[PDB]
């Protein structure tokens, strides 16, 4: 078969010859018992750059030795791209949410031989599921491969906002000292009120990491956690988002993007937030009105905003969240640490091993079958 | 009395008109039950900038309404400084480790009225204890005031270093995207081995904050933590440092040459070090080497040598550093507490009533 695999670009300086460390830490399962990927074998060293065009998810040797073809490109946008030209006869498509090859209806019409749409990572937002269903296209993901990655990045961003880390580090890096400058916007996190919207994999991992900071933990979700978890972490349940926000020193978001949660943080709803509240969002850019948030950081309504999701994405060069005051932004990278890649590359081979073997794909991996 | 209070400069845009937030969280006690400072009153609103010259630790009205004089200065280096010149007849000296007024033996000997040498913050690193003992000067610190602050700053640094946050952020700020240039040096913290050298107020606060990141926690110290603590945090004790460094992905140094080219040989290839303890603790050039060569994957801290660090201090710009100026213990939050404890010690001292034992370093003519 033909496998089309859309990956992001290599580093500008070129593809890493060497890495910072020899291996990654061994992990057996994810919180909640789901074991890590279990491919029969892997042809990479964990810790290699696997999600860029030259890392190829460690897939080529295994694909080819077994008589399949692998075409790897980063050129995925619109009608004339390599992605689009190669799709028409592709049996498998693989891409990452960090560089998504969209499987629009129009595109799935054309993928005459498409059998598998694989997310190397989590979700299927780039894939029209109903179209996949009508064409008998199996849609899979590497469930949980990066939920912990994203919660670490969230807690890191909360701390960094609270303690005014990024400007503080600019002062060192630029030759200054300027203690009062570093700290006239700097607080401890301790005993702050932190709320989370949704406590799925990500949210729950975030509250768990927050707990020993002796913050006061709040949350809201479609459905509540087992009361025993609520007890072991001292959660305050809030029935609505808009009930939670007023009492939170820090709000972290884990919503999916739907017309309802689109621009749900705006100049209006921002009146619900405590003055000098911090927001962290690694869910979806659009959950927060772009210009409203910059506004808010300009007038002191919010004291910091951070996240790695943006609208549009890739974010334009002049995107105002890049340079707004008191921001701790990163490009959309949090679930593509080299650690997460190693997991999702193994997951990707694992799905492919099963798929190619007429063996059934893990239930947790399937989105559509 | 004359009280001589040395403090850091105001921000370059001036003393703040308004602040980010309207108040600070309530904290009940410190880990282990030590209470928060207990002055009769404060004259500041917690959250104000107190540790710069215009903040005056919020001590003016109080000192002066009691018939005392308060001289507040940032000028503390040399004999022609406002500090040394006002020192000769000061009854009380206050400074912060963030802008410390050294009480060297020659200074203490010139300090003819010196009764109380007060740290607004922790320790007495800048005070010659022998001379204070010989000269019957009491030395007090506001114990615990910023241990939690430093701990946060540590775990913040550890995450940032491990996840390559700072450069990733520099890419966003600068109009870039460059996913692979962000993550080609980024990892998750989860399941790495993290070691702390010493598990006192900071070390243990750190360990507790790392626990739910599912790291493997190591520590060494003069003594073991209680077994109940070791067990709740699945700590692995190490009897020597030498024994702990080899197994650790991240080493955080928390004190209560000697990390050099030789001792770095014990560190795992790609280890991270975070040092909020003392500048000189990690050899400037060993560290810079180790990062240039990749023997270490990161270094961060808030303490430097020399300190203040000279504009060209290589730790500022070396690869994979996550440095800040010396600030971890002087968040607005930490300041409220130590201004408070500074006032408390003062009230007690002035009325001839005894200072908390826990605040005391030197009293009478001995270590207390």
Beta strands at B360-363 and B138-141: parallel, antiparallel or unpaired: antiparallel
The residue among B281, B335, B320, B321 whose CA lies nearest residue B303 is: B281
In B163-194, which positions are buried (b, 16+ CB within 10 angstroms) versus exposed (e)? bbbbbbbbbbeeebbbbbbbbbbbbbbbbbbb
- B1-145+330-368 and B146-329: same fold? yes
Contact A197, A240 (CB under 8 A): no
The residue among A270, A319, A310 whose CA lies nearest residue A293 is: A270
The length of chain B, given as a count of residues:
368
DSSP A99-121: B---B-HHHHHH-TT--EEEESS
CATH assignment, A1-145+336-369: 3.40.50.720
Token pair for A322: 């890049």
**Look-up: residue for tokens 């007495």?**
B124
Residue B14 backbone phi and psi in degrees, to 5? 105, 170
Give the C-alpha separation, A305 to A301, whole Å: 11
Contact B191, A27 (CB under 8 A): yes
- Other CB atoms within 10 A of residue B285 CB: 12
Three-state secondary structure string covering A188-254: CCCCCEEEEECCCHHHHHHHHHHHHHCCEEEEECCCCCCHHHHHHHCCEECCCHHHHHHHCCEEEEC
CATH assignment, A146-335: 3.40.50.720
Give the C-alpha separation, B130 to B362, whole Å: 9
Give the C-alpha separation, A223 to A238, whole Å: 11
Token pair for A100: 């998504």
Sheet of B138-141: strand order equals B69-73, B2-6, B92-95, B116-119, B138-141, B360-363, B366-367
CB nearest B181 (choices: A11, A177, A318): A11
Give the C-alpha separation, B244 to B220, whole Å: 7
CB nearest A187 (choices: B168, B294, B331): B331
Catalytic residue among A153, A185, A193, A284: A284
Three-state secondary structure string covering A144-197: CCCHHHHHHHHHHHHHHHHCCHHHHHHHHHCCCCCHHHHHCCCCCCCCCEEEEE
CB nearest B173 (choices: A27, A174, A323): A323
Contact B211, B219 (CB under 8 A): no
Give the C-alpha separation, A55 to A44, whole Å: 9
| Residues of chain A with C-beta less than 8 angstroms from the C-beta of B172 | 315, 321-322, 327, 329-331
Closest Cα of chain A to B165: distance in Å? 7
- Measured CA to CA in angstroms, residue A315 lies from A292, A329, B175 at distances of 17, 11, 9
Beta strands at A366-368 and A138-141: parallel, antiparallel or unpaired: antiparallel
Contact B314, A173 (CB under 8 A): no
Give the C-alpha separation, A236 to A193, whole Å: 10
**A188–B331: do the CB atoms touch at under 8 Å?**
yes
Q: Is the peptide bond before B258 cis (omega within 30 degrees of 0)?
A: yes
Closest Cα of chain A to B19: distance in Å? 7
Contact A41, A332 (CB under 8 A): no
Give the C-alpha separation, B306 to B284, whole Å: 9
Catalytic residue among B126, B278, B289, B356: B278
CB neighbours of A7 closer than 8 A, spacing ≥ 6? Answer: A51, A52, A53, A55, A56, A57, A72, A73, A74, A95, A96, A99
**A181–B11: do the CB atoms touch at under 8 Å?**
yes
Give the C-alpha separation, B35 to A68, whole Å: 69
Token pair for A358: 């007429």
Question: Cα(first)–Cα(last) distance of chain A, in Å?
Answer: 19
Beta strands at A69-73 and A2-6: parallel, antiparallel or unpaired: parallel
Residue A284 is among the residues annotated as catalytic for this protein: yes
Helix (H, G, I), strand (E, B) or coil at A92: strand
Extents of the domains making up chain B = 1-145+330-368, 146-329
Q: Phi/psi zone of residue B352: left (φ > 0), alpha (ψ -120 to 50 degrees), beta?
A: left
Token pair for A351: 């799905």
**B189–A152: do the CB atoms touch at under 8 Å?**
yes
Token pair for B46: 């917690």
- Measured CA to CA in angstroms, residue A187 lies from A161, A183, A331, B2, B259 at distances of 9, 8, 26, 32, 30
Token pair for B314: 């290589």
Long-range CB contacts (within 8 A, 24+) of B344-353: B344/B37, B344/B38, B344/B39, B345/B116, B345/B118, B345/B140, B345/B142, B346/B3, B346/B59, B346/B63, B346/B92, B346/B116, B346/B118, B347/B39, B347/B40, B349/B92, B349/B115, B349/B116, B349/B138, B349/B140, B350/B1, B350/B66, B350/B68
The residue among A261, A264, A252, A146 whose CA lies nearest residue A199 is: A252
Give the C-alpha separation, B82 to B4, whole Å: 10
Burial class (CB in 10 A: 0-12, 13-18, 19+), B43: middle
Q: Is the Cα dihedral A256, A259, A264, A269 positive or negative?
A: negative
**B8–A180: do the CB atoms touch at under 8 Å?**
yes
Helix (H) or strand (E) holding A130: helix A129-134
Give the C-alpha separation, A155 to A150, whole Å: 9
DSSP A327-367: B----S-TT-SHHHHHHHHHHHHHHHHHHHHTPPP-TTTEE
The residue among A96, A76, A140 whose CA lies nearest residue A114 is: A140
Nearest chain B alpha carbon to A233: B212
- Other CB atoms within 10 A of residue A291 CB: 13
Q: Is the peptide bond before B306 cis (omega within 30 degrees of 0)?
A: yes
Annotated binding site of B for NAD(+): 147, 201-202, 221, 256, 276, 302, 326-329
Residue A313 is among the residues annotated as catalytic for this protein: yes
The residue among A18, A10, A94, A86 whose CA lies nearest residue A54 is: A10
User: Which experimental approach was used here?
Assistant: X-ray
Residue B254 is among the residues annotated as catalytic for this protein: no
Give the C-alpha separation, B306 to B278, whole Å: 11
Give the C-alpha separation, A319 to A285, whole Å: 12
Token pair for A51: 């999600």
**A25–B249: do the CB atoms touch at under 8 Å?**
yes
Task: Give B30's Cβ-side CA count (13 Å radius).
Answer: 21
Nearest chain B alpha carbon to A149: B188
The residue among B4, B3, B140, B1 whose CA lies nearest residue B81 is: B4
**B183–A274: do the CB atoms touch at under 8 Å?**
no
CATH code matching the domain that covers B146-329, chosen among 3.40.50.720, 3.40.50.740, 3.40.109.10, 1.10.10.10 = 3.40.50.720
Contact A15, A8 (CB under 8 A): no
Residue B16 backbone phi and psi in degrees, to 5? -65, 130
In whole angstroms, what separates CA B109 from the centre of its chain?
Answer: 28
Three-state secondary structure string covering chain B: CEEEEECECCCCCCCCCCCCCCCCCCCCECCCCCECCCCCCCCCCECECCCECCCHHHCHHHHHHCCCEEEEECCCCCCCCHHHHHHCCCCEEEEECCECCCECHHHHHHCCCCCEEEECCCCCCCECHHHHHHCCCEEEECCCCCHHHHHHHHHHHHHHHHHCHHHHHHHHHCCCCCHHHHHCCCCCCCCCEEEEECCCHHHHHHHHHHHHHCCEEEEECCCCCCHHHHHHCCCEEECCHHHHHHHCCEEEECCCCCECCCHHHHCCCCEEEEECCCHHHECHHHHHHHHHHCCEEEEEECCCCCCCCCCCCHHHCCCCECCCCCCCCCCHHHHHHHHHHHHHHHHHHHCCCCCCHHHEEEECCEEC
Helix (H) or strand (E) holding A368: strand A366-368
| Residues of chain A with C-beta less than 8 angstroms from the C-beta of B173 | 322-323, 329
Nearest chain B alpha carbon to A212: B209
- DSSP letter at A369 equals -
Annotated binding site of A for substrate: 122, 146
Helix (H, G, I), strand (E, B) or coil at A59: coil
Helix (H, G, I), strand (E, B) or coil at A83: helix
Sheet of A69-73: strand order equals A69-73, A2-6, A92-95, A116-119, A138-141, A366-368
In CATH, which superfamily holds the domain spanning B1-145+330-368?
Answer: NAD(P)-binding Rossmann-like Domain (3.40.50.720)
The length of chain A, given as a count of residues:
369
Annotated binding site of B: 122, 146-147, 201-202, 221, 256, 276, 302, 326-329
Contact A21, A138 (CB under 8 A): no
Residue B234 is among the residues annotated as catalytic for this protein: no
């Amino acid at each position: 078969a033909k496998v089309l695999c859309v990956l992001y670009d290599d580093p500008v300086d070129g593809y890493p010859k060497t890495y910072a460390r020899d291996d990654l830490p061994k992990i057996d399962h994810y919180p909640g018992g789901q074991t890590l990927p279990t491919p029969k074998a892997i042809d990479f060293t964990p810790g290699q750059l696997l999600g860029s065009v030259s890392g190829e998810l460690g897939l080529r040797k295994y694909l080819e030795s077994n008589g399949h073809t692998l075409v790897v490109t980063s050129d995925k946008d619109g009608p004339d791209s390599v992605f689009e030209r190669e799709l028409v006869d592709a049996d498998v498509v693989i891409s990452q949410p960090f560089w998504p090859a969209y499987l629009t209806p129009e595109r799935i019409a054309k993928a005459k031989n498409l059998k598998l749409a694989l997310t190397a990572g989590i979700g299927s937002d780039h894939v029209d599921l109903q179209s996949a269903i009508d064409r008998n296209v199996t849609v899979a993901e590497v469930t949980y491969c990066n939920s912990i990655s994203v919660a670490e990045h969230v807690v890191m961003m909360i701390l960094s906002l609270v303690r005014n880390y990024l400007p503080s580090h600019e002062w060192a890096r630029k030759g200054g000292w300027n203690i009062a400058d570093c700290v006239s916007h700097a607080y401890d996190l301790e005993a702050m009120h932190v709320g989370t919207v949704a406590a799925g994999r990500i949210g729950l991992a975030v509250l768990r990491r927050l707990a020993p900071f002796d913050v006061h933990l709040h949350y809201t979700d479609r459905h509540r956690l087992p009361e025993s978890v609520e007890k072991e972490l001292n959660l305050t349940w809030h029935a609505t988002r808009e009930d939670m926000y007023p009492v939170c020193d820090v709000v972290t978001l884990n919503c999916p993007l739907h017309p309802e949660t689109e621009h749900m943080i705006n100049d209006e709803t921002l009146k619900l937030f405590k003055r000098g509240a911090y927001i962290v969002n690694t869910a979806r850019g659009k959950l927060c009105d772009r210009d409203a948030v910059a506004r808010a950081l300009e007038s002191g309504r919010l004291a910091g905003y951070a996240g790695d999701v943006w609208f549009p994405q890739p974010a334009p060069k002049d995107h105002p969240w890049r340079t707004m005051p008191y921001n701790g932004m990163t490009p959309h990278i949090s679930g593509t640490t080299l650690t997460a890649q190693a997991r999702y590359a193994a997951g990707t081979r694992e799905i492919l091993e099963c798929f190619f073997e007429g063996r059934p794909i893990r239930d947790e991996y399937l989105i559509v079958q």
